Amino acid sequence: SRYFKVTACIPSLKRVRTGRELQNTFFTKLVPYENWFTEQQRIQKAGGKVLSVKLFTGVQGANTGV
Amino acid sequence: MQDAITAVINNYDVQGKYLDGAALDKLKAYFTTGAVRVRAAAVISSNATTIIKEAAAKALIYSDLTRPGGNMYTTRRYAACIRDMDYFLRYATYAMLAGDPSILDERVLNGLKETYNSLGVPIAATVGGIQAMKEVVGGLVGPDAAKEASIYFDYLSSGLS
Amino acid sequence: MQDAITAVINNYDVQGKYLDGAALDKLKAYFTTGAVRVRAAAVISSNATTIIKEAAAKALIYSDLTRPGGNMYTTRRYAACIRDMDYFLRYATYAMLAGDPSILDERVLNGLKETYNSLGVPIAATVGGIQAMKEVVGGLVGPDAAKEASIYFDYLSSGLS
Amino acid sequence: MQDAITAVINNYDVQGKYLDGAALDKLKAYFTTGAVRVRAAAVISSNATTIIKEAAAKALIYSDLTRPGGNMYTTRRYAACIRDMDYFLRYATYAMLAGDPSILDERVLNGLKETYNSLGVPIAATVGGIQAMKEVVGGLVGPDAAKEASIYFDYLSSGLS
Amino acid sequence: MQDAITAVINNYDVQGKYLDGAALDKLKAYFTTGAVRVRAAAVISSNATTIIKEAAAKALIYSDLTRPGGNMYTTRRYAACIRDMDYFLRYATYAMLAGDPSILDERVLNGLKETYNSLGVPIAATVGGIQAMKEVVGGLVGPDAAKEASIYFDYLSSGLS
Amino acid sequence: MQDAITAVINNYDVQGKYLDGAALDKLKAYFTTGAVRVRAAAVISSNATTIIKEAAAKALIYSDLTRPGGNMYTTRRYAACIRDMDYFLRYATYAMLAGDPSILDERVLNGLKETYNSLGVPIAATVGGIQAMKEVVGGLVGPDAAKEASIYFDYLSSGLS
Amino acid sequence: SVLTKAIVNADAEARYLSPGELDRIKSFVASGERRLRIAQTLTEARERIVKQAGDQLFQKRPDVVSPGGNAYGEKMTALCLRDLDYYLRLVTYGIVAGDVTPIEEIGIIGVKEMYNSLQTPIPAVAEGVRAMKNVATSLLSGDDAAEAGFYFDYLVGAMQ
Amino acid sequence: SVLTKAIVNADAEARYLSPGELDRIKSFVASGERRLRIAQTLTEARERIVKQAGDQLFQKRPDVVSPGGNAYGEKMTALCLRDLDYYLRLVTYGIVAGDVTPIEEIGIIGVKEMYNSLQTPIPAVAEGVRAMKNVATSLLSGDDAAEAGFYFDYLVGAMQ
Amino acid sequence: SVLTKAIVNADAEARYLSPGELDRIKSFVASGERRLRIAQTLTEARERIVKQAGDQLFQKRPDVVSPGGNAYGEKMTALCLRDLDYYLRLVTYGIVAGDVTPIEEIGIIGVKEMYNSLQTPIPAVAEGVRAMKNVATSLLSGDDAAEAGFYFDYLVGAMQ
Amino acid sequence: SVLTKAIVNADAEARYLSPGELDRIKSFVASGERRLRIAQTLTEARERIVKQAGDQLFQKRPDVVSPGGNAYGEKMTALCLRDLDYYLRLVTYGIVAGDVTPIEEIGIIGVKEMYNSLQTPIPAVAEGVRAMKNVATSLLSGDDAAEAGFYFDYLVGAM
Amino acid sequence: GQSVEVGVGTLRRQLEHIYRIAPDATRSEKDVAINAIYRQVLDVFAGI
Ligand SMILES: *[C@H](C)[C@H]1/C(=C/c2[nH]c(/C=C3N=C(/C=C4\NC(=O)C(CC)=C4C)C(C)=C\3CCC(=O)O)c(CCC(=O)O)c2C)NC(=O)[C@@H]1C
Ligand SMILES: *[C@H](C)[C@H]1/C(=C/c2[nH]c(/C=C3N=C(/C=C4\NC(=O)C(CC)=C4C)C(C)=C\3CCC(=O)O)c(CCC(=O)O)c2C)NC(=O)[C@@H]1C
Ligand SMILES: *[C@H](C)[C@H]1/C(=C/c2[nH]c(/C=C3N=C(/C=C4\NC(=O)C(CC)=C4C)C(C)=C\3CCC(=O)O)c(CCC(=O)O)c2C)NC(=O)[C@@H]1C
Ligand SMILES: *[C@H](C)[C@H]1/C(=C/c2[nH]c(/C=C3N=C(/C=C4\NC(=O)C(CC)=C4C)C(C)=C\3CCC(=O)O)c(CCC(=O)O)c2C)NC(=O)[C@@H]1C
Ligand SMILES: *[C@H](C)[C@H]1/C(=C/c2[nH]c(/C=C3N=C(/C=C4\NC(=O)C(CC)=C4C)C(C)=C\3CCC(=O)O)c(CCC(=O)O)c2C)NC(=O)[C@@H]1C
Ligand SMILES: *[C@H](C)[C@H]1/C(=C/c2[nH]c(/C=C3N=C(/C=C4\NC(=O)C(CC)=C4C)C(C)=C\3CCC(=O)O)c(CCC(=O)O)c2C)NC(=O)[C@@H]1C
Numbered sequence A: 001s002r003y004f005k006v007t008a009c010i011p012s013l014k015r016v017r018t019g020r021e022l023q024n025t026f027f028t029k030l031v032p033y034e035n036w037f038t039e040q041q042r043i044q045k046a047g048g049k050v051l052s053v054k055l056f057t058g059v060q061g062a063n064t065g066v
Numbered sequence B, C, D, E, F: 001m002q003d004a005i006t007a008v009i010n011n012y013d014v015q016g017k018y019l020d021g022a023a024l025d026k027l028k029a030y031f032t033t034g035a036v037r038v039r040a041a042a043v044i045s046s047n048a049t050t051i052i053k054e055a056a057a058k059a060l061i062y063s064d065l066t067r068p069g070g071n072m073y074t075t076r077r078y079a080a081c082i083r084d085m086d087y088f089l090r091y092a093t094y095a096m097l098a099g100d101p102s103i104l105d106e107r108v109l110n111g112l113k114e115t116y117n118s119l120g121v122p123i124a125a126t127v128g129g130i131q132a133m134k135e136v137v138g139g140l141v142g143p144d145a146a147k148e149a150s151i152y153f154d155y156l157s158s159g160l161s
Numbered sequence G, H, I: 001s002v003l004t005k006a007i008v009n010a011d012a013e014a015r016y017l018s019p020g021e022l023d024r025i026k027s028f029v030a031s032g033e034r035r036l037r038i039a040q041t042l043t044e045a046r047e048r049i050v051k052q053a054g055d056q057l058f059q060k061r062p063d064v065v066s067p068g069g070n071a072y073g074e075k076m077t078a079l080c081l082r083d084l085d086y087y088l089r090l091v092t093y094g095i096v097a098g099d100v101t102p103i104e105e106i107g108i109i110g111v112k113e114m115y116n117s118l119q120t121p122i123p124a125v126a127e128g129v130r131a132m133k134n135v136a137t138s139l140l141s142g143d144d145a146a147e148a149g150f151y152f153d154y155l156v157g158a159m160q
Numbered sequence J: 001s002v003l004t005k006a007i008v009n010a011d012a013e014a015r016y017l018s019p020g021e022l023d024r025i026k027s028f029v030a031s032g033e034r035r036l037r038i039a040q041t042l043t044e045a046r047e048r049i050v051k052q053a054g055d056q057l058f059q060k061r062p063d064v065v066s067p068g069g070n071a072y073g074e075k076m077t078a079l080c081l082r083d084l085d086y087y088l089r090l091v092t093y094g095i096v097a098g099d100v101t102p103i104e105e106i107g108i109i110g111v112k113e114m115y116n117s118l119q120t121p122i123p124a125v126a127e128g129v130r131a132m133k134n135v136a137t138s139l140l141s142g143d144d145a146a147e148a149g150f151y152f153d154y155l156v157g158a159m
Numbered sequence K: 001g002q003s004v005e006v007g008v009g010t011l012r013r014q015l016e017h018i019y020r021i022a023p024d025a026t027r028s029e030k031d032v033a034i035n036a037i038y039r040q041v042l043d044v045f046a047g048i
């Protein structure tokens, strides 16, 4: 399956949190292609900015094996 | 995101200035436009499916894209493209109500370029589709609304290109 | 991932061409090889533990690596290295059945070099281990199977290096 | 994380050497310092709120930052900044007990620069605040403890800058 | 949840009947009461902290409960009790706006008795607190609003007991 | 959970009484027993695997249970039973250090009977196994420790039955 | 209803109603009496609205009332008209509520699935609702019509 | 703002704006011109409102302006008045927005934490806001005052 | 208590007690007899510690015992002293337990919320505890005082 | 180490170190000097401890050093002794640290897997460690021996 | 009269430990978290 490597930064505008949030704030992650759409939306809704997106696995414009 | 009213407020807040007449005038301008915008939004929501259909017919379909080896070939890709078209329409409607382009930047425009480049989706074709939607929308909304609607569609197009 | 049969299909699908005799011949070629491959895979699965043991004995153990200050020193690191060896073996077996190198690229090969460089794992030693596994595997599978098995092992080695 | 005792152990382990008198001396040195450190830590914990208050008064407040258009303007941002200050203090206290700067690198220092740059938080001002906290802490802990405390504060400052 | 307007609608929907004048009259009745209710709700929200304080002073505090061996003894338990009081107030305000007791049944009343019995919280004391809040609320809201407010408070009390 | 020291404290706290000599004597009693308990716990941890083995040999194995159609027949079930045995041992050790049976009630005892009845695990056989573990443990810990250890084992047995 | 929606948002946030939310409630209660009249008008004209809309729909879509089509035959045509009547009743409920929620629970959730099992074409149903809107608009005064239009538009949007 | 709130709810639901939501937007745009005037009035009277409210607060709470108290001394008293001014500016922003959201982001989130570090008493701050409300109410017409009151009340509720 | 804390950490890890953990338990049981005496001393001097600390607190904070202040009046002053007594009892419990957990459950969780409803200033309460520490320290021997100080410091840290 | 463990628990809770935790740190620093001596003793006697333990193990298990057995042959026997030496070094590290964590990372995680690939019998490795404990105990004073025993026992438990 | 452990009680709190994986964290730290993930999702209450 196609996989996405995503780097994004998210700010906590609603509430101040005592516990360390640094992992949540800046998170380079591998996302399944199917999941990424929803994940991208979630980052946008948070007001976080997605710094970089790359397709880690799979071939672009492949009809099958996707 | 921001709206026109909040945008004025935010600019004043960073200055620390109390709201002034010049600021008030901008707010007043928005308030008059508001009623028109609400009517336009309702029109778009009701005709959304058709708007997408017409726009696709104008640009996307009966083309190399739909033919094998084209980006929108296969049902899965076709469905994806029309889903994206719907997104653009919904967000443009939101922007029109808001009176501010910022929401487009915050939600639609951010990260889309990178996604599309990895996917190999063709930007110019997408832009073409957006422009087509604009034309269809312009008709339905009418004169009062079309000018307002057009700017947000153009904003999306400029961002992508 | 992709397999030989699907690879042929995919190539035809992008062309939009119906399957033709030339394509059929490639598929037919695969089908004859298939029976041999299945036998080889069963041999490898049964002897997997031993294959790894022999290969480690040939290259990894009794070396500076295992001695203190070496990358495979400490139980944790030793265990990691043999786990990696198992991965390579399992994936090579999968590739041999599939008749396609793509799975190796999609799962094993992608990002491995970078991971290893950050970790400070020595690539050349790893490659040596893969080559050792190949030699052991070649014996067990027998000559006809060995040629097929060897290409996937070599593919892994080339990717890492 | 790592501590002074474990750091010595780890250095010996990579060499494979058994612990020797020279190593023992370093460990012994730490053990004498330990009692002082514990006392200092208790002082800091009790006076933590005040330390932050004093440091903010020295650098952060009555400044452009707090004024509209400044990074620490608005209650939300003000609260965030003092939360960050508390983090630095708590981690420095942990480091002082540990006798090792590693924990600062592993938790606080890693990714902070990048986070701050995206946020638009000013690093130099933050560093200023850390230095201010150091000065306040130095007083409370007393001279012997102050030297030990200072190095960790300086380490944080250098990392951020 | 349900509100008065929706309750009328739902009754008609099960009958399948179109809305009729008698139904309209009930809706009209609600609409007149509405303005009063909105004013009352704003009063309660602003004075919520004080309302709770006064009610606690009237019943809960200076009592065996707060004394050691009492349910509200210890900070944790004290805080829990005032949190519960706040819940009751917020939900009663919601019910007053809605004009329907159903939300109280759906959220607050359901399972509360069982929870309290397991916890060993005393129901009668809780009821006493609710009644006290009602009295304080009655004053602030004023007489016309008080009658409406009282019924929801009484509903909560009856449910718990 | 609770421990002996905290149990004394809690009894005094509900009374609101400051700690008194009689209370102190109970605490002092615990402190003397403490050293023995720590030694016993270390013995049990080291010999845990063997304790389970011996107890199983005494009761569980060479029995109808292990024979086909028995609850402990099949590897999966056998493994489950020895896992449960380990749980009981670990918790009993915790209880012995604590000097209080409460942890057993909170973690092990709660809902176990019901779980076992649904599963069809035989309670009496399990109890037998616990008693067997007790006997083995008694030997290793030595007499003074054994009395203390026995009470917690008996507590588990009584709870299950 | 408006009020239910506001309360629900507040409960999610675990806060008392915001001033803005309160203001909307105030506006709604003032509007209600006008809304009641709009609903009453449509109820009285219900029978004719349905009849006129049906005819328009059948003219716009000959296929639906054709041997192949789902609507074809007396039984089927009656059911199609009954459906139009149902949607009109829902719209009236919506106007009094001031929100689509009442409409939504009864009519718009699972609608696609229901019609797909029936094999009724969803677009044709939408056209029928559009037709009903036009008839209803004519009887209503302009401002009243705009209010009614929003609810009608929602239905058309939902069934799409 | 009202509009921002509506859009955000729609986006979460991933739907176009509901008719009810659209209606509230319509009401808001009509109200806006009145709202602008209310805001303008308070801006002009800003300096006096702050001054009068300050005096009232100090009379109600002698302690705050006492050697122990935080407000005591010229520098400190100025800062207390500056804070009151800040809150008034926020309230004006709120009235034009028609929602507390603008107010909330700038002033009400983390307010407790900020004041606790400062050691300023939160209840006294609330009293100051209450005082400002009373002054503002007097200058405003009754209906205008009610609108303004809601925003003032929210602030008082937030700082509690 | 120390033992409870150790067990809890082990259970989270799902392991038998570590040697290091066992060693800490051993140290604690040896320390206990000394700890018991320290606690006994404070209990005997309890009445005077509270009285002296109260006076110091009132000198430090005139405001609390002033008509505005919460502590003002005989009833209120008694309650303030009762609170100080409560905290002292908790500290004694802590010393015997060897951990703050007993103290923490009874006194430090929800303390902010309780005092905020009461409107008692949290910093003043902290000062009272500090005052009690100083009195207690004087009666205790130096080493004993250090042990007691840690528990006193924790309380001050918890509530500020 | 003790200190690392305490800090880690505090960081998870996001709190400053508890008094109880601080007390444990104090106890540890006092103990450390004694601990250093215990470690030093074992280091000096290392060579003999390993040798004596090895002999005991070989007497206990003739099979391992037999033509069939893994340990058989000089090369293999040396490797078995080297392993015993490794474990002793780990134990000394543990004593100075006051915690098993240093031991655990280097020696106890993945140990099963490593030995299973080697085919070395684990239930005899454990015996070797037990043997080393007995030798070490004799050289150590009683109280010192008890401290050392705990670490030795942990190793035996871990396998 | 009631005791500290009466309502919610002490135990449930303090048997919850937030776990965050850190890149530089030592293996044993990391594994403990990993084990807990398995523990909660797959209900492996042995906990390994
Ligand atoms: C024939 C059985 C029915 C029918 C067909 C019909 N299709 C279109 C238009 C398109 N159909 C497709 C379909 C595909 N493209 C793909 O890549 C795949 C997967 C391999 C499929 C199945 C596409 C993409 C189009 C768009 C136009 C194009 O050819 O590029 C039409 C015309 C569309 C219109 O609305 O005018 C029609 C009529 N329709 C029926 O009624 C038949 C039952
Ligand atoms: C249609 C006009 C064009 C087209 C569309 C197309 N898109 C994808 C895949 C994705 N599109 C997006 C877009 C968005 N992400 C967001 O966050 C937003 C804002 C709400 C948008 C608009 C994303 C994330 C993806 C990837 C994930 C997913 O599939 O949902 C495809 C599929 C590409 C592929 O085959 O791999 C297609 C076809 N492509 C065209 O050619 C048209 C010009
Ligand atoms: C007056 C009603 C009360 C009072 C106020 C007071 N405030 C300060 C100091 C500050 N207050 C603020 C407040 C804000 N900054 C913001 O961004 C916002 C939201 C828009 C607010 C409300 C800040 C940042 C400061 C710090 C100083 C600075 O800004 O430069 C003081 C000074 C006290 C001190 O110790 O410094 C005072 C006295 N005090 C009272 O007792 C009154 C009830
Ligand atoms: C105070 C001296 C300066 C300041 C601070 C400030 N920080 C933020 C936001 C964040 N700060 C952090 C930092 C950390 N989180 C961690 O876990 C750690 C390590 C333990 C650190 C150091 C993070 C992650 C955030 C983002 C989300 C959050 O609230 O934690 C802000 C707010 C930025 C915003 O606009 O939201 C501020 C103001 N800024 C200054 O002006 C001071 C110089
Ligand atoms: C023979 C190849 C090897 C060997 C066997 C051996 N087994 C035992 C004891 C038991 N073995 C089992 C096994 C099973 N129970 C099941 O349900 C299944 C799957 C269906 C199996 C495989 C059990 C349960 C026991 C315990 C006794 C009982 O049946 O109740 C022993 C005896 C050991 C003892 O002390 O109990 C032995 C010797 N051991 C070897 O050395 C051979 C290589
Ligand atoms: C061994 C002496 C006896 C035995 C054990 C046995 N247990 C199971 C299955 C389960 N046992 C439990 C027990 C617990 N779960 C908990 O959460 C707790 C307390 C916190 C306990 C003690 C549970 C829940 C199960 C089911 C799922 C699981 O095993 O994780 C079995 C197997 C039953 C099955 O069908 O899977 C066995 C064999 N049974 C005997 O006959 C011995 C006397």
Ligand SMILES: *[C@H](C)[C@H]1/C(=C/c2[nH]c(/C=C3N=C(/C=C4\NC(=O)C(CC)=C4C)C(C)=C\3CCC(=O)O)c(CCC(=O)O)c2C)NC(=O)[C@@H]1C
Binding pocket: E060, E061, E062, E063, E066, E067, E073, E074, E075, E078, I064, I069, I070, I071, I076, I077, I079, I080, I081, I083, I084, I086, I087, I106, I107, I118, I120, I121, I124, I125, I128
């Ligand atoms: C003294 C330093 C400060 C002070 C004290 C004060 N307290 C109250 C009222 C209460 N105090 C408590 C506190 C506790 N209950 C507990 O369970 C514990 C821990 C064991 C504590 C510390 C409670 C519950 C009350 C409520 C009344 C009651 O006990 O029934 C008051 C009066 C309350 C009022 O005026 O409303 C006072 C004055 N106040 C200060 O300002 C001093 C600095």
Ligand SMILES: *[C@H](C)[C@H]1/C(=C/c2[nH]c(/C=C3N=C(/C=C4\NC(=O)C(CC)=C4C)C(C)=C\3CCC(=O)O)c(CCC(=O)O)c2C)NC(=O)[C@@H]1C
Binding pocket: C061, C062, C063, C066, C067, C072, C073, C074, C075, C078, J064, J070, J071, J076, J077, J079, J080, J081, J083, J084, J086, J106, J107, J118, J119, J120, J121, J124, J125, J128
């Ligand atoms: C002696 C008690 C037993 C025994 C020994 C034995 N060991 C090996 C081989 C290896 N031992 C290790 C183990 C470690 N490496 C580490 O880093 C650590 C932690 C510090 C340990 C414990 C390793 C890596 C090897 C592999 C070879 C090498 O050292 O490079 C052998 C040889 C293996 C073989 O089968 O040829 C032997 C014989 N064997 C027994 O039977 C005794 C019970």
Ligand SMILES: *[C@H](C)[C@H]1/C(=C/c2[nH]c(/C=C3N=C(/C=C4\NC(=O)C(CC)=C4C)C(C)=C\3CCC(=O)O)c(CCC(=O)O)c2C)NC(=O)[C@@H]1C
Binding pocket: E060, E065, E071, E072, E076, E077, E078, E080, E081, E082, E084, E085, E087, E107, E108, E109, E112, E115, E119, E121, E122, E125, E126, E129, K006, K007, K008, K009
């Ligand atoms: C105060 C008037 C009285 C009082 C209350 C009290 N309650 C608890 C604990 C709980 N109370 C609830 C109740 C609710 N949960 C809900 O969802 C609702 C409906 C919105 C209610 C009212 C629950 C579930 C708990 C337990 C969970 C929790 O505390 O978060 C306590 C303390 C019990 C404890 O051990 O913490 C108390 C004291 N008791 C009195 O003495 C007053 C008469």
